[PDB]
Design a protein around this ligand. Structure first.
Ligand SMILES: O=c1c2ccc(-c3cn[nH]c3)cc2ncn1Cc1ccccc1
Lengths: 57, 625, 339
């Protein structure tokens, strides 16, 4: 009842008091990660059938 | 044909069928013949810690039947200090100091009643009701019991099940035949009636009351009553499977042999009296006691026959004037007077009198006007021909007292008052019950003794509950004929089938180690004609019904959530299960026995309902819009 | 009164978090990525149909070798396939028919599963006599088991309809840690690449980020209008996506503590059942209640392609560690492998 509503506001304090970066920086990190690994993504563009385990290989 | 038992898998269905009825108890099973037999097998050959109790129990059952007291004094000695005694006391189960006190107490005074060891029987059972019975349920003997109970509960007899021999009777509704049941070979009498005649003579109320009265008295194996074992009916005739009595009736033998003496009459009176005592303990008044209903076997012993006019009085306390004129008591004449068994004690007087003189005590001038006979019986008192003896006088004078308040058997102790008449003072009623006295007349084994139409329908409805089977008698027949041998080959057929699954298998067992609810065979026919009847082994789980053929685990199923309903349908005069599936499709099942149909119909409804109610409250499983 | 002051303070803290998040909403992922070229039309073909399950499939999970995968079905079985050949390496009948989830241990030594039995059962795949036998039944949840994932061979995280998650000590069979916070059935969970964190998605329309070693909820994410049925981390562990009954996927970034994008479409009205990323994170794949799997451009929110090869719900999917293929599980009994 009260120990629960008190348990809540204490939890929100842990979530409110944290460090947050800008969305612009967070979004660039993601875009940079994708770019740095586009060549390793076999679903991004098909790979030679010789390198495809589920095709002739 | 040849009794074939179901395969052990029938246990899965049968055990749930019985459990639902509370018939899976030590009392309900032990008290059965095939039950006791199989249970005894398990205890003597498989649970050593219980073998001694069954040994002792059976030695007491043997002692109970000893007729001569000199035997009972000799056996109660051997038993009391037997190795079974120093084997029960040695182990865990020494009889209570109180029980042992009673026994040797009667031994001291050298008194050996047949129930001498009864305090031991009760304690013996009190020590078989728990773990011992539970260990028996877990064993393959109860399994075999389920296989037998499935046969018993799946009985649908037809005339093809009996080999009929000569005719042994005849009347206004049908003949009585001598036949042999093909399954076991036991000799029975088949009393065939005819719905065509019954309707003509308006005797439907009688044909139904005879089978309800036969049901009430056909328990206990009374030796002095033509008792019923089965009841069925083709689409045209009612059938009773009764005790075989190929020896004519007294009404016939009376005319041929001539009048009987007090001694020859005494034999019949004693055997008859024991028949009445049997019915009267089951609150059944016969009301038609006459020589023509007294049958003889091939040895000359008698039985009361044709319970058509019998009646219950445990609640009814019956009605009015029913019987044969000349044998009906006063209370059985005043159509406004209630009477119980006292109607038979009076009817026995007229019964025996006609055997000693040759005519009813109230019909001398050979009068056919019932109002005359009913007048002499209700008014003037009977006066014996002086040729009757003093004791014979006391009996008939007592059994014919118009006042029920002053008649033998009507004074509060029943037949125990007739049995004590000095006329029977020379008789040992124990030996009477055992049929050890010489019959006065032995019939020769070659006797001859002694249309219209109308259609059917709605009268067939009045017989929808005619088919019947007395459990006690079908089991007894089986026990005394084919039981032990069937159980022998059935054991070999099951062992070789297991040995074969060994060479092919190492797979089993599909129904174990999961949440399987029930399994067994059924016949499936699918959507549509484009399939035909196919037999498969089904497994019912909480969320699906799987099935397989032989030599391959199940590749097909049917989920509880796609099952819309479960209806009972009709096909080829055979009842089936109709499963409506979501996509408008249908799935029909046909079980091998009536119990299976009841248990599958029940377990499928419970399974799919609980499952659909369950899936609905599961986000990941329920259907979303 | 003391409860009215705690409710008002709680809503004040919610304002701070809301305003604090807005404070760093300087730009949108859509804007940042307008310069990269679109991925184009993503087309894949069915390379394998995995046949064997007799009824609906509810879950699968790839092994770390990108070759073996386990799946649990309405038929009360776990099947462990070899996707290359399609052969079955194991067919595990379960002691409870209501299995809803299953997991594959990184070591490949064990799988797990559970459901309406409220139990997470561990199965040893490397036994003495080659026999597969139940080697542990983790009991403790008061509701069904919705998902589970091995940290290693001695630890497993589980989510339950009882509102909670838990970390387990597979040896002692005891709940090392409880994760209490959600207010609805927890439906899915995903482990960060470092296994030091994980995120859950429940029917309260929210996902939470949990500290594995401290049993504390560190951040809460909202925005969905319906239950979250699926969740998965971005390959680098700094973000994750969610699939909801509200017909949308959503991307959430941890450092920015808020939602970056939303993948939806006026023609897609059914709910999402499963989400997985391509190896590089460029593609967000999601199975739908309309029998389809849609491939989304993770960075630009376009729909690149559609995997259409099931006659009923796509209930689960997964992408292999080597990124070579996607597996789709369906209510039609079948698993298919695409690339
Ligand atoms: O002819 C019989 C008869 C013959 C045999 C047996 C018998 C019983 N057990 N063994 C032989 C009993 C019987 N009872 C009665 N009636 C008269 C009757 C005939 C047709 C319809 C109704 C009554």
């Amino acid at each position: 009842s009260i120990a629960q509503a008190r348990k809540l506001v204490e939890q929100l304090k842990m979530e409110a008091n944290i460090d947050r970066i800008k969305v612009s920086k967070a979004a660039a990190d993601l875009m940079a990660y994708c770019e740095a690994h586009a060549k390793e993504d076999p679903l991004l563009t098909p790979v030679p059938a010789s390198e495809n385990p589920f095709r002739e290989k | 044909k040849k009794i074939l038992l179901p395969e052990p898998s029938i246990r899965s269905v049968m055990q749930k069928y019985l459990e639902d009825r509370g018939e899976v108890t030590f009392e309900k099973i032990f008290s059965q013949k095939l039950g006791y037999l199989l249970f005894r097998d398990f205890c003597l050959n498989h649970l050593e810690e219980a073998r001694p109790l069954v040994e002792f129990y059976e030695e007491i059952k043997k002692y109970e039947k000893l007729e001569t007291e000199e035997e009972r004094v000799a056996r109660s000695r051997e038993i009391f200090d037997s190795y079974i005694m120093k084997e029960l006391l040695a182990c865990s189960h020494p009889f209570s100091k109180s029980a042992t006190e009673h026994v040797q107490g009667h031994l001291g005074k050298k008194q050996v009643p047949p129930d001498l060891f009864q305090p031991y029987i009760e304690e013996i059972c009190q020590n078989l009701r728990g773990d011992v019975f539970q260990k028996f349920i877990e064993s393959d003997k109860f399994t075999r019991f389920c296989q037998w109970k499935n046969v018993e509960l799946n009985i649908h007899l037809t005339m093809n099940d009996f080999s009929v021999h000569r005719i042994i009777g005849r009347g206004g509704f049908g003949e009585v035949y001598g036949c042999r049941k093909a399954d076991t070979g036991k000799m029975y009498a088949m009393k065939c009636l005819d719905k065509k005649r019954i309707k003509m003579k308006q005797g439907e109320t009688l044909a139904l009351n005879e089978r309800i009265m036969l049901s009430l008295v056909s328990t206990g194996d009374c030796p002095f009553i033509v008792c019923m074992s089965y009841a069925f009916h083709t689409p045209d005739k009612l059938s009773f499977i009764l005790d075989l009595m190929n020896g004519g009736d007294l009404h016939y033998h009376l005319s041929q042999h001539g009048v009987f003496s007090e001694a020859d009459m005494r034999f019949y009176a004693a055997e008859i009296i024991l028949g009445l005592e049997h019915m009267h303990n089951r609150f059944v008044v016969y009301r038609d006691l006459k020589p023509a209903n007294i049958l003889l076997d091939e040895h000359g012993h008698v039985r009361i026959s044709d319970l058509g006019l019998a009646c219950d009085f445990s609640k009814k306390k019956p009605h009015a004037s029913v019987g044969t004129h000349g044998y009906m008591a006063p209370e059985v004449l005043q159509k406004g007077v209630a009477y119980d068994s006292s109607a038979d004690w009076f009817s026995l007087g007229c019964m025996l009198f006609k055997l000693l003189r040759g005519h009813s005590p109230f019909r001398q001038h050979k009068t056919k006007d019932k109002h005359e006979i009913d007048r002499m019986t209700l008014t003037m008192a009977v006066e014996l021909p002086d040729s009757f003896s003093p004791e014979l006088r006391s009996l008939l004078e007592g059994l014919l007292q118009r006042d029920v308040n002053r008649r033998l058997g009507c004074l509060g102790r029943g037949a125990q008052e007739v049995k004590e008449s000095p006329f029977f003072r020379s008789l040992d009623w124990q030996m009477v019950f055992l049929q050890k006295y010489p019959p006065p007349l032995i019939p020769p084994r070659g006797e001859v003794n002694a249309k219209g139409i109308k259609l059917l329908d709605s009268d067939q409805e009045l017989y929808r509950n005619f088919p019947l089977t007395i459990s006690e008698r079908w089991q007894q027949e089986v026990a005394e004929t084919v039981f032990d041998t069937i159980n022998a080959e059935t054991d070999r057929l099951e062992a070789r089938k297991k040995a074969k699954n060994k060479q092919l298998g190492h797979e089993e067992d599909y129904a174990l180690g999961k949440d399987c609810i029930m399994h067994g065979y059924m016949s499936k026919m699918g959507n549509p004609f484009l399939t035909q009847w196919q037999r498969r082994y089904f497994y019912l789980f909480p969320n699906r019904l799987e099935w397989r053929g032989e030599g391959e685990a199940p590749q097909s199923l049917l989920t509880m959530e796609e099952i819309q309903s479960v209806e009972e349908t009709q096909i080829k005069e055979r009842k089936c299960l109709l499963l409506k599936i979501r996509g408008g499709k249908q799935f029909i099942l046909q079980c091998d026995s009536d119990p299976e149909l009841v248990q599958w119909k029940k377990e499928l409804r419970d399974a799919y309902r609980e499952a659909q109610q369950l899936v609905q409250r599961v986000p990941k499983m329920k259907n979303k819009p | 009164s003391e409860l009215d002051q705690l409710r008002q303070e709680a809503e004040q803290l919610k304002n701070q978090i809301r305003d604090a998040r807005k404070a760093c909403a300087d730009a949108t992922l859509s804007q940042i990525t307008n310069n990269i070229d679109p991925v184009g039309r993503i087309q894949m073909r069915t390379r394998r149909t995995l046949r064997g399950h007799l009824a609906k499939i509810y879950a699968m999970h790839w092994g770390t070798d990108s070759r073996l995968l386990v799946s649990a079905s309405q038929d009360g079985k776990l099947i462990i396939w070899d996707s290359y050949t399609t052969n079955k390496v194991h067919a595990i009948p379960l002691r409870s028919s209501w299995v809803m989830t299953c997991a594959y241990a990184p070591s490949g030594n064990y799988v797990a599963c559970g459901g309406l039995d409220n139990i997470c059962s561990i199965y040893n795949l490397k036994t003495r006599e080659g026999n597969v036998r139940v080697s542990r039944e983790l009991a403790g949840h008061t509701g069904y088991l919705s998902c589970c994932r091995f940290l290693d061979d001695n630890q497993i995280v589980t989510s339950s309809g009882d509102t909670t998650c838990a970390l387990w000590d597979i040896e002692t069979g005891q709940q090392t840690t409880t994760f209490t916070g959600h207010t609805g059935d927890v439906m899915s969970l995903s482990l960060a690449p470092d296994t030091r964190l994980f995120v859950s998605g429940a029917c309260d329309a929210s996902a939470k980020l949990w500290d594995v070693r401290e049993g504390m909820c560190r951040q809460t994410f909202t925005g969905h209008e319906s239950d979250i049925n699926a969740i998965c981390f971005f390959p680098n562990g700094n973000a994750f996506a969610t699939g909801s009954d509200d017909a949308t996927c959503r991307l959430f970034d941890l450092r920015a503590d808020q939602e970056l994008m939303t993948y939806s479409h006026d023609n897609i009205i059914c709910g999402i059942t499963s989400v997985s990323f391509s190896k590089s994170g460029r593609l967000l794949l999601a199975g739908y209640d309309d029998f389809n799997c849609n491939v989304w451009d993770a960075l630009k929110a376009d729909r690149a392609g559609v995997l259409a090869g099931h006659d009923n719900r796509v209930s689960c999917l997964g992408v292999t560690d080597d990124g070579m293929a996607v597996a789709t599980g369906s209510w039609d009994s079948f698993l298919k492998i695409w690339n």
